[PDB]
Structure 1
Amino acid sequence: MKKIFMMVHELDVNKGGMTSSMFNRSKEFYDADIPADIVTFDYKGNYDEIIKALKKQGKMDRRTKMYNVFEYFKQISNNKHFKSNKLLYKHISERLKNTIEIEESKGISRYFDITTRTYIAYIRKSKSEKVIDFFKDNKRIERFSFIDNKVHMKETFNVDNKVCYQVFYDEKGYPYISRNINANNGAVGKTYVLVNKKEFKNNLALCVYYLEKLIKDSKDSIMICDGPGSFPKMFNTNHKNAQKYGVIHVNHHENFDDTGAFKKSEKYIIENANKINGVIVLTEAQRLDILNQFDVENIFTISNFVKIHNAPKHFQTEKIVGHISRMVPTKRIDLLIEVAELVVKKDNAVKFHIYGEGSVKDKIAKMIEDKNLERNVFLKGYTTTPQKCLEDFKLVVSTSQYEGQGLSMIEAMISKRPVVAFDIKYGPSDFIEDNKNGYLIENHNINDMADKILQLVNNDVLAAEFGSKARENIIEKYSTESILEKWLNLFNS
């Protein structure tokens, strides 16, 4: 009788970390016979294709559903009609009646009225996608978006050529939702659900009503909000029996901040912990800190579910140090380069393998060139199989400054690869036992980190013992059975 609704703004094939957490939590909750589906709030004309792709990938469990605010009212309109809205298509054909086609490409074409010479429409076709832009006195006023020759969206433009209004059409061509867009920022204003006849102030108000409609108000209906920006959608509902939980996936203090400010969305989630069933944080250190920083007590520590794959058959004897992450500023790959330079200066043999892609990639590539670390530091690009890459490492490293837990570090430990990491807020101290299953470095101490890398990289006996103890610890501390027990304990409170 228990059912779970997991909130996040959107799902997409590129996304990772928070979605991957939600995807596995769903798999685990479904395995424990508690359906755990995902609720999204954005609009995408191709959501069916995206969900099919995430499932084929093996990323999203087949059992996992995605409820979407738009998709829900879309299927209500689909059942509401049997015949297509031929009147909209005819209205479009009549606009391009006395035209003459002038191409630019295969799909790309411009249409002009042969009796006036006025620019009327721009049409761009791309296999499944088609966009029709309509003009008045040489300026774009409208846009009809198509998938498989069926209209799904109409956008209204202003004098400055920004979208000021949107309409969403069902599979038969019927407008089910319409809304105002504030030109300057792109904020969702006044909304109209045509399928139900109802009207809302903004997207917040719509999604609040939608959650009140999707989720039955009973003790067995559980709302878990992962997306920090979409916490007000869960928070503001009228539900009086249904459970309300917030998951914080990051460190709550602002990144690269010396003022000591908190992340705004997280600050709000936190402040309102007593007013809901609870707020989940990944590590005990985060919870303790939150309790001393805020006048709130309803904070719970539940590590994210951990996937314990079998360990590599063989340990790596070769002096290979691994780093698998998104190439982003918080990861501090600049500090890993500064450490690599210190490591390679004392030992020529050691090699650094850095997997991933992102914003810092070019700044780090040029950094290897300056420090003449070409023969020892390798940017290997993105990996679809980090588990396989891990087999090839003697140890794993983390220069990251900010984390909620640090899943790559946990992943490395599962694959019997010890971690040498900066002792940051939050995560490394939760799972690394210094001088037993890896090393905890004083944050920014590039020299002490370099030392422990050299010690572990040149000791085949220490590397295998730290690796084997790293795996045993993840199994002991983050067992699926213990994590599910913590969640259940809250659901049954």
Structure 2
Amino acid sequence: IDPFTMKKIFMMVHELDVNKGGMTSSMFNRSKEFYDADIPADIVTFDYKGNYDEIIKALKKQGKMDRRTKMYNVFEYFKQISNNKHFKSNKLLYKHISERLKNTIEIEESKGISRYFDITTGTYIAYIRKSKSEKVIDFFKDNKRIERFSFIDNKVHMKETFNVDNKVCYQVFYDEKGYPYISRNINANNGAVGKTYVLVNKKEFKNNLALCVYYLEKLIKDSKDSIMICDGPGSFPKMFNTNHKNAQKYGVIHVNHHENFDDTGAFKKSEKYIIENANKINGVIVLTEAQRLDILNQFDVENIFTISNFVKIHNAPKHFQTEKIVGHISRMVPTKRIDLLIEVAELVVKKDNAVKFHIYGEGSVKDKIAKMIEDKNLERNVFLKGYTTTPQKCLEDFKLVVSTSQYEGQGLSMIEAMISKRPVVAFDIKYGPSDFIEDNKNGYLIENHNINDMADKILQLVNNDVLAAEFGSKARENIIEKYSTESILEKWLNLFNS
């Protein structure tokens, strides 16, 4: 509303990075929408990367992140404090590294890889592997690795320490002048972060949780204009344990709060903790009004709200596709019951050998879908392409896309395919495509068991390229008028203004 509002939204996820999607791409778009309504919506991360500036720069150039959206990082905050406490490069650090490397001889392995040996004792001193903009230096003691200095543009940003099993047990972070501002213990057995020492402020913290809580109380002004939104479930404790009294906290659950493949009536451990404590924050936000009603009818909480996702209606291809191409662009995870779909490919091709499948994306169950299509020799017909950073250009050469799951928040990947004139085929599930797919109108829906009824539907479409177009043009105009943005945006503000 107000073009000069002091409202601001801090969206919290553990890490940002390139070549993902789903929850993050939803966060990127949500930031874009809020910025349009003159409300700054930025992102807060809590992990360390020495090249986040290069990653954020990439995410914006590659058109995945609105350029107005900033990422706040806990380590970038304390680094910048450190930067303004010193006004002289930390040469003693580079002298420390230089001194351990002198009186050594060099022996090359390959192009930018060399080892160094003391010319007096013959002792193994260092291993240096340098690219062109980054460099690592591994120091050795008693022929075991003890330390690694990491470089970016000839500058140290991290020092790692290694135990007896050659695993990290300690990290140090150096500012842009070479001064250490943060160091922390690492449990080598699981990689969990322990005690964290903020050297620049001479303060210690029990763990990363205690550090980021302290960080948010510094980053986020305790005003009712400050709004915290936690997408990732692994960041919720950070938002919940702050001593904010005025600031708002909204937990956004993205997934089904039901345990995967459990008929007990049990929930996800983390996704339930959020729900239980809904009456202590400003309310948990789901996506379907169904999932609201389920949580209503399970937990004693008077504070759940349903808000869908902003959709970006990009532009459909100039044409369609004629050749019997079916695709499944997704990340391979057992929760999607892909086992209960590739046994529809098999059920299709035998009635029509010209139907082809292009599988994109990666995952854990990729390598056993791989060693499964050749057991049946559908390598002939089915292809596991790979991860595509161009989801739409791979989408615009489909006749239709296919997907399934037993657990979803809603339809993200199915919706954005319907825009590109593509009639997707999926099951009816708990929370998802019971609303944006109208069966025998612009797409198809099947009970999540009748595995050849889906195999029946595909042949009603791929063999009818003139009917696999009207269903596509009735897809896009279906998305557009159904949820919009204003309907969704006013959901958010009325929650804010209260």
Which TM-score tier does this pair reach, normalised by the shorter chain? over 0.9
Normalising to structure 1: TM-score of the pair? 0.93
SS in 1 for 2:222: coil
Q: Is the 8 A contact 2:279 2:301 kept in 1?
A: yes
SS in 1 for 2:234: helix
Matches within 5 A, 1:366-445: 366-445=371-450
- Measured in 2, the distance between the counterparts of 1:382 and 1:91 equals 43
- Measured in 1, the distance between the counterparts of 2:16 and 2:223 equals 27
* Inter-CA distance 98–173: structure 2 relative to 1 (3 Å threshold): same
Deviates more, 1:455-464 or 1:88-97: 455-464
Deviation digits for residues 311-331 of structure 1 (CA, Å, limit 9, x no counterpart): 344454554433222233333
* Inter-CA distance 121–3: structure 2 relative to 1 (3 Å threshold): same
- Give 1 or 2: higher helix fraction: 1
Please state how far the C-alpha of 1:287 moved relative to its aligned partner: 1.8
SS in 1 for 2:106: strand
* Inter-CA distance 104–324: structure 2 relative to 1 (3 Å threshold): closer
Deviates more, 1:128-137 or 1:223-232: 128-137
- Measured in 1, the distance between the counterparts of 2:353 and 2:171 equals 61
Please state how far the C-alpha of 1:472 moved relative to its aligned partner: 3.0
Deviates more, 1:306-315 or 1:11-20: 306-315
- Measured in 2, the distance between the counterparts of 1:341 and 1:22 equals 37
Deviates more, 1:341-350 or 1:309-318: 309-318
Q: What are the ranges of 5 or more consecutive residues in structure 2 without an aligned counterpart? A: 1-5
* Inter-CA distance 416–92: structure 2 relative to 1 (3 Å threshold): closer
* Inter-CA distance 114–338: structure 2 relative to 1 (3 Å threshold): same
Please state how far the C-alpha of 1:260 moved relative to its aligned partner: 4.3
Please state how far the C-alpha of 1:417 moved relative to its aligned partner: 2.2
* Inter-CA distance 187–375: structure 2 relative to 1 (3 Å threshold): closer
SS in 2 for 1:34: coil
Deviation digits for residues 215-270 of structure 1 (CA, Å, limit 9, x no counterpart): 00111111111111111011111111111011122222233344443222212222
* Inter-CA distance 138–355: structure 2 relative to 1 (3 Å threshold): closer
Please state how far the C-alpha of 1:8 moved relative to its aligned partner: 0.6
- Measured in 2, the distance between the counterparts of 1:3 and 1:263 equals 31
Deviation digits for residues 287-324 of structure 1 (CA, Å, limit 9, x no counterpart): 22222222223222111110112334445455443322
Deviates more, 1:184-193 or 1:434-443: 434-443
Counterpart selection for 2:247 from 242, 247, 251: 242
* Inter-CA distance 283–95: structure 2 relative to 1 (3 Å threshold): same
- Measured in 2, the distance between the counterparts of 1:288 and 1:432 equals 21
SS in 2 for 1:370: coil
Q: Is the 8 A contact 1:7 1:225 kept in 2?
A: yes
Please state how far the C-alpha of 1:211 moved relative to its aligned partner: 0.3
Q: What are the ranges of 5 or more consecutive residues in structure 1 without an aligned counterpart? A: none
* Inter-CA distance 180–353: structure 2 relative to 1 (3 Å threshold): closer
Counterpart selection for 1:66 from 71, 77, 97: 71
* Inter-CA distance 412–99: structure 2 relative to 1 (3 Å threshold): closer
SS in 2 for 1:457: coil
SS in 1 for 2:327: strand
* Inter-CA distance 353–125: structure 2 relative to 1 (3 Å threshold): closer
Deviation digits for residues 4-46 of structure 1 (CA, Å, limit 9, x no counterpart): 1111111111222111111111111111111111101011111
Deviation digits for residues 59-88 of structure 1 (CA, Å, limit 9, x no counterpart): 111111011000111111112211111112
Please state how far the C-alpha of 1:421 moved relative to its aligned partner: 1.1
Counterpart selection for 2:123 from 105, 118, 122: 118
SS in 1 for 2:84: helix
Q: Is the 8 A contact 1:247 1:279 kept in 2?
A: yes
- Measured in 1, the distance between the counterparts of 2:455 and 2:316 equals 26
2:26 maps to what in 1? 21
2:3 maps to what in 1? none
* Inter-CA distance 250–169: structure 2 relative to 1 (3 Å threshold): same
1:342 maps to what in 2? 347
- Measured in 2, the distance between the counterparts of 1:240 and 1:88 equals 43
SS in 2 for 1:25: helix
Please state how far the C-alpha of 1:431 moved relative to its aligned partner: 1.5
* Inter-CA distance 353–103: structure 2 relative to 1 (3 Å threshold): closer
Deviates more, 1:422-431 or 1:39-48: 422-431
SS in 2 for 1:452: helix
Deviates more, 1:391-400 or 1:15-24: 391-400
* Inter-CA distance 391–151: structure 2 relative to 1 (3 Å threshold): closer
Q: Is the 8 A contact 1:357 1:381 kept in 2?
A: yes
Q: Is the 8 A contact 1:270 1:279 kept in 2?
A: yes
Please state how far the C-alpha of 1:282 moved relative to its aligned partner: 2.0
Counterpart selection for 1:491 from 474, 491, 496: 496
Please state how far the C-alpha of 1:376 moved relative to its aligned partner: 4.0
Please state how far the C-alpha of 1:349 moved relative to its aligned partner: 4.4
Please state how far the C-alpha of 1:210 moved relative to its aligned partner: 0.4
SS in 2 for 1:80: coil
User: How many residues get paired?
Assistant: 493
- Measured in 2, the distance between the counterparts of 1:207 and 1:401 equals 35
- Measured in 2, the distance between the counterparts of 1:107 and 1:468 equals 54
Q: Is the 8 A contact 1:225 1:231 kept in 2?
A: yes
Q: Is the 8 A contact 1:283 1:430 kept in 2?
A: no
Q: Is the 8 A contact 2:287 2:306 kept in 1?
A: yes
Please state how far the C-alpha of 1:374 moved relative to its aligned partner: 4.3
Please state how far the C-alpha of 1:114 moved relative to its aligned partner: 3.2
Q: Is the 8 A contact 1:142 1:156 kept in 2?
A: yes
1:274 maps to what in 2? 279
Q: Is the 8 A contact 1:222 1:244 kept in 2?
A: yes
* Inter-CA distance 123–430: structure 2 relative to 1 (3 Å threshold): same
* Inter-CA distance 339–177: structure 2 relative to 1 (3 Å threshold): same
- Measured in 1, the distance between the counterparts of 2:208 and 2:309 equals 30
* Inter-CA distance 98–320: structure 2 relative to 1 (3 Å threshold): closer
SS in 2 for 1:83: coil
Q: Is the 8 A contact 2:160 2:172 kept in 1?
A: yes
- Measured in 2, the distance between the counterparts of 1:319 and 1:90 equals 65
SS in 2 for 1:229: coil
Deviates more, 1:39-48 or 1:253-262: 253-262
- Measured in 2, the distance between the counterparts of 1:142 and 1:319 equals 56
